[PDB]
Copies of this chain bind each other. A is one copy, B any other.
């Protein structure tokens, strides 16, 4: 049985196979249990209350009760707890608050913070509402924990109300916190860099503080809003994992603190850096939604839990189970140097190889002949497109292709009519020169005039043209914060930018819900669950190298479903890596994701065209297995591995892709075992027609054979009889 229960001084937040059990102790909220379902909880794992040196107390005479030593669900500074705080509010002469629990309510169904991405399909949920108050400060803090009946996830966020007669200022307000008992733990995060997104990092939890964060105004290439706290020795198949994630695309922080007693605090939320929030009397602030997800089936377990939750409750329903079009994108193919004839020729060749969607990338607007001007000027360059965008689109439609278009709405060039008309719309500081990045500036989406302008321009573009797909780019990070009329308004502008962004994209994606929106930020610079609420796929990386893509796809699909993960067959030598890779391998690597093509098909040989046509026919068949099926990692492409292998199951279909990076010699062949088959099932391998029991494939496995050479790959395809 699932939902929320209030029983004496215990609160039970009960998702499928995941419970949070909280105790109200004289107004303080204690974390009793987070993990597998327990009913009729007694307190076997309660904190033993004793006098801990230098851990102080709310009363003079009781030295054994201390907020320094109790496990909690939110953290304050100044009451005796010295662990990192998650709520900190300035009021009058202090930033000490003392919020005490006053009352609990339970909601059913749809619920979430206004103006921020939050779960959908909530009919079968309940929400615990914990109302806290600081009577002296006249502030309310309300905590929300939501259950899901079909996933081992709990969602959380908070609302702070200013009920005083004076302005107060929020300095810290995280979205989730948990104190976990002293034990050995490891943490897994996704970090990396541009052209190396979502690098899987694992390390031991150590005394002190570990954190990942972005202060870039976007979640960023080099850190994802995720942190997995794992049982010592977790594997792909076994051990406990708790994943905490944030539905937010701006500045965030995730941290793990191991304190003097060996206790462990984890939290995720808006980054304190670049953040303050003024609340006038009666104003309130709601934090982005955090998620806590649990598996006892190791890292594959947490992958499945997280992917499932995303598919059912974050990604748009219109697209979450919809096969995505195999596209051609002209960017690597032509860069800025294209015109109508070139486009239609590429379109002709795309149609012959059976590509479904044609995406016109950067350079169709203003005088965008390079990347030094024109952002902000969303006017069609009819000279370059050889007529109206309407006529181009009709040409593409008549060739039997869907039509897609690149935008970069959040940005403005100095050399643009937009900047000439409104220089103050850029994020900037009075009396400081601009800081430049790709020779462009960032629009101040905290400015409601900026949001109104973008709604208007883009609504016009989408209503007047038959566009099937949008690629929404964002190509630099935020510098030079100083657009407020006061310091405090500037401290607010990075979050207000996000609120402006989400108002913009929720509006457009809702008003034009037939269009497939793909998010992008120089590839994976903003690939988070805030964006995935509105954009059901993402350009995972500008790195289109088949081999460099292996660790990238490993990370990009670790917590996020494969269907989200844009991957394109590109030209050789690869433009990022300077590498030759077999076209077969480029195909197989991209087919572990959401397949498209990005190279000049008009300059291919007849053979290369035929190969691509064969790849497209293959993927039309594999697409449901890849995009709708269950993913199992078999060999991980980490920093030391010479191999990658990934399996997908979907009904009677099982496929396995294998890649080897460097050629080897006098080395026994790898034995590759499949997972999650029917032991008694009979599995027919397409290439040799042999029929194997599931037991054989899982417990004996495949001897993997390759010729001599680098970057070779192969695919095994099975049908269950």
Known: A484-B93, A487-B90, A576-B665. A529 touches B117 (CB 8 A): yes
Most chain B Cβ neighbours within 10 Å, of A58, A63, A198: A198
Known: A96-B432, A224-B527, A503-B115. A78 touches B479 (CB 8 A): yes
Residues B217 and A477 in contact, CB atoms below 8 Å apart: yes
Contact of A346 with B by CB under 8 A: no
Task: Determine the chain B residues whose CB is within 8 A of the CB of A578 once the complex forms.
Answer: 663, 707-710
Task: Determine the chain B residues whose CB is within 8 A of the CB of A221 once the complex forms.
Answer: 53-54, 260, 521-525
Residues B206 and A209 in contact, CB atoms below 8 Å apart: no
Task: Determine the chain B residues whose CB is within 8 A of the CB of A478 once the complex forms.
Answer: 216-218
Contact of A41 with B by CB under 8 A: yes
Q: Per-residue CB proximity of A199-232 to B under 8 Å, as 1/0?
A: 1110110111111110111111111111000000
Of A307-315, A337-345, A417-425, A536-544, the one with at least 4 CB within 8 A of chain B: A536-544
CB contact list, A668-720 vs B, under 8 A: 668-671, 690-693, 695-703, 705, 707-710
A675–chain B nearest beta-carbon distance, Å:
13
Task: Determine the chain B residues whose CB is within 8 A of the CB of A696 once the complex forms.
Answer: 38, 40-42, 44
Residues B195 and A671 in contact, CB atoms below 8 Å apart: no
For this chain, the copies found in one complex come to 4
Known: A482-B93, A703-B45, A703-B46. A666 touches B193 (CB 8 A): yes
Contact of A623 with B by CB under 8 A: no
Task: Determine the chain B residues whose CB is within 8 A of the CB of A497 once the complex forms.
Answer: 217
**Which residue from chain B places its CB closest to the CB of A538 in the assembled complex?**
B197
Known: A209-B210, A639-B640, A667-B261. A552 touches B78 (CB 8 A): no
A682–chain B nearest beta-carbon distance, Å:
8
**Which residue from chain B places its CB closest to the CB of A486 in the assembled complex?**
B93
Which single member of B183, B432, B558 contacts A98 (CB below 8 Å)?
Answer: B432
Residues A44 and B666 in contact, CB atoms below 8 Å apart: no
Contact of A324 with B by CB under 8 A: no
Residues A703 and B477 in contact, CB atoms below 8 Å apart: no
Contact of A638 with B by CB under 8 A: yes
Which single member of B210, B435, B490, B576 contacts A94 (CB below 8 Å)?
Answer: B490
Of A184-192, A611-619, A643-651, the one with at least 4 CB within 8 A of chain B: A184-192
Residues B77 and A215 in contact, CB atoms below 8 Å apart: yes
Contact of A196 with B by CB under 8 A: yes
Of A234-242, A378-386, A392-400, A591-599, the one with at least 4 CB within 8 A of chain B: A234-242
**Which residue from chain B places its CB closest to the CB of A708 in the assembled complex?**
B578
Q: Per-residue CB proximity of A111-151 to B under 8 Å, as 1/0?
A: 00001111000000000000000001000000000000000
Residues B709 and A579 in contact, CB atoms below 8 Å apart: yes
Task: Determine the chain B residues whose CB is within 8 A of the CB of A325 once the complex forms.
Answer: none
Residues A431 and B136 in contact, CB atoms below 8 Å apart: yes
CB contact list, A475-498 vs B, under 8 A: 475-491, 494, 497-498
Residues B666 and A96 in contact, CB atoms below 8 Å apart: no
Contact of A433 with B by CB under 8 A: yes
CB contact list, A454-511 vs B, under 8 A: 475-491, 494, 497-499, 502-503, 506
Contact of A39 with B by CB under 8 A: yes
On chain A, the number of residues with a Cβ less than 8 Å from chain B's Cβ atoms is 194
CB contact list, A259-276 vs B, under 8 A: 259-263, 273-274
Task: Determine the chain B residues whose CB is within 8 A of the CB of A237 once the complex forms.
Answer: 238
Contact of A289 with B by CB under 8 A: no
Contact of A82 with B by CB under 8 A: yes
Contact of A526 with B by CB under 8 A: yes
Q: Per-residue CB proximity of A19-37 to B under 8 Å, as 1/0?
A: 0000000000000110111
Task: Determine the chain B residues whose CB is within 8 A of the CB of A45 once the complex forms.
Answer: 671, 700-703
Known: A525-B221, A671-B183. A57 touches B437 (CB 8 A): yes
Contact of A409 with B by CB under 8 A: no
Known: A207-B191, A220-B477, A480-B96. A523 touches B57 (CB 8 A): no
A497–chain B nearest beta-carbon distance, Å:
7
Residues A198 and B556 in contact, CB atoms below 8 Å apart: yes
Contact of A361 with B by CB under 8 A: no
Contact of A79 with B by CB under 8 A: yes
Task: Determine the chain B residues whose CB is within 8 A of the CB of A477 once the complex forms.
Answer: 54, 56, 82, 216-218, 220
Task: Determine the chain B residues whose CB is within 8 A of the CB of A668 once the complex forms.
Answer: 181-182, 261-263
Contact of A555 with B by CB under 8 A: yes
Task: Determine the chain B residues whose CB is within 8 A of the CB of A92 once the complex forms.
Answer: 430, 482, 487
Which single member of B190, B195, B218, B524 contacts A523 (CB below 8 Å)?
Answer: B195
Task: Determine the chain B residues whose CB is within 8 A of the CB of A604 once the complex forms.
Answer: none
A332–chain B nearest beta-carbon distance, Å:
15
**Which residue from chain B places its CB closest to the CB of A551 in the assembled complex?**
B199
Contact of A233 with B by CB under 8 A: yes
Task: Determine the chain B residues whose CB is within 8 A of the CB of A530 once the complex forms.
Answer: 116-117, 219, 225
Which single member of B32, B196, B434, B638 contacts A665 (CB below 8 Å)?
Answer: B196
Contact of A104 with B by CB under 8 A: no
Most chain B Cβ neighbours within 10 Å, of A59, A494, A528: A528
Residues A136 and B432 in contact, CB atoms below 8 Å apart: yes
Contact of A12 with B by CB under 8 A: no
Task: Determine the chain B residues whose CB is within 8 A of the CB of A475 once the complex forms.
Answer: 54
Contact of A48 with B by CB under 8 A: yes
Task: Determine the chain B residues whose CB is within 8 A of the CB of A218 once the complex forms.
Answer: 477-478, 521, 525-526
Residues A481 and B96 in contact, CB atoms below 8 Å apart: yes
Contact of A99 with B by CB under 8 A: no
Contact of A278 with B by CB under 8 A: no
A665–chain B nearest beta-carbon distance, Å:
4
Contact of A554 with B by CB under 8 A: yes
Residues A54 and B665 in contact, CB atoms below 8 Å apart: no
Known: A45-B700, A193-B261, A238-B239. A215 touches B93 (CB 8 A): no
Contact of A439 with B by CB under 8 A: yes
Question: With A41-B700, A80-B435, A117-B531 given, can you name 8 additional A-B contacts, CB distance below 8 Å?
Answer: A39-B695, A41-B696, A54-B216, A61-B439, A79-B479, A195-B666, A260-B666, A576-B708
Can you give 27 contacting A-B residue pairs, CB < 8 Å? A39-B693, A40-B693, A52-B194, A54-B437, A54-B477, A56-B435, A57-B435, A57-B437, A60-B436, A78-B435, A78-B480, A79-B480, A94-B430, A96-B482, A182-B667, A189-B208, A190-B559, A192-B555, A198-B524, A199-B551, A200-B636, A203-B204, A217-B477, A219-B527, A235-B235, A577-B663, A578-B709
5 closest residue pairs by CB, A with B: A198-B555, A217-B478, A56-B437, A578-B708, A238-B238
